[PDB]
Amino acid sequence: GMTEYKLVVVGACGVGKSALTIQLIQNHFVDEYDPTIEDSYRKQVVIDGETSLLDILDTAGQEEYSAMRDQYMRTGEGFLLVFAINNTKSFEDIHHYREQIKRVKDSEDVPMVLVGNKSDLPSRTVDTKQAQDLARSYGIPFIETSAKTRQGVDDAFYTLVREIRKHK
Ligand SMILES: *CCC(=O)N1CCN2Cc3ccc(-c4c(C)ccc5n[nH]cc45)c(Cl)c3OC[C@@H]2C1
Numbered sequence: 401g402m403t404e405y406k407l408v409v410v411g412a413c414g415v416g417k418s419a420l421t422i423q424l425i426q427n428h429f430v431d432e433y434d435p436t437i438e439d440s441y442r443k444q445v446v447i448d449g450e451t452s453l454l455d456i457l458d459t460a461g462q463e464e465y466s467a468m469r470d471q472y473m474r475t476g477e478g479f480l481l482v483f484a485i486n487n488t489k490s491f492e493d494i495h496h497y498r499e500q501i502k503r504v505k506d507s508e509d510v511p512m513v514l515v516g517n518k519s520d521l522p523s524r525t526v527d528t529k530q531a532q533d534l535a536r537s538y539g540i541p542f543i544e545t546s547a548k549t550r551q552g553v554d555d556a557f558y559t560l561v562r563e564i565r566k567h568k
């Protein structure tokens with residue numbers, strides 16, 4: 401029957417990964433969601449008229465590598481690389497996330513979308529230009545989002561699914 405998409409949401413602590421996922425799945429904003437909890441969450445959506453089952457891994461836990469997380473990441477079909485526009489370190493970290501995703505997937509041209517979250521905030525330290533240029537270098541789309549307002553949330557996950565469909 402319906403197609404399942406194994407999505408993974410990655411990025412530095414506090415960028416909005418959980419707030420983004422909960423918005424997509426549950427349609428509300430959760431301030432200060434428990435930072436320890438890593439889980440996968442499912443939702444059926446219609447995208448370009450095709451019914452699809454999104455299985456979304458909201459990454460958390462500790463800053464450590466394991467063989468087990470290598471294997472969970474390897475099973476992911478596409479990844480949202482999330483930073484916050486008010487957190488330059490989070491944007492610098494994107495490169496290291498991509499490097500490790502590529503390591504665990506044999507350097508495949510992996511479906512990835514760059515996400516600049518917290519776009520509602522006036523305290524920007526990452527210029528949109530720098531994000532656009534980074535996504536251009538990686539050959540991936542870049543979406544601006546606010547989990548708080550819901551701006552761009554559907555576009556981020558739908559674009560990733562469209563990237564996975566385009567890929568094979
Ligand atoms: C505030 C907590 C939070 O949301 N975090 C912090 C911990 N963690 C970082 C982290 C580190 C490594 C990896 C990773 C990746 C990207 C690929 C392969 C791999 N094998 N072992 C670990 C690996 C990941 Cl997925 C994460 O997830 C983000 C969270 C964010």
Ligand SMILES: Nc1nc2c(ncn2[C@@H]2O[C@H](COP(=O)(O)OP(=O)(O)O)[C@@H](O)[C@H]2O)c(=O)[nH]1
Pocket residue numbers: 411412413414415416417418419420430431432433434435517518519520521545546547548549
């Ligand atoms: N203003 C604003 N705050 C956000 C947004 N997304 C998440 N937050 C807040 O940023 C903090 C971290 O979000 P969280 O979802 O826990 O980040 P995660 O660590 O990446 O899972 C929390 O206080 C959230 O309410 C956003 O788009 N705008």
Ligand SMILES: [Mg+2]
Pocket residue numbers: 417418433434435436437458459460
């Ligand atoms: Mg979280």
Ligand SMILES: [Mg+2]
Pocket residue numbers: 462464
């Ligand atoms: Mg441990």
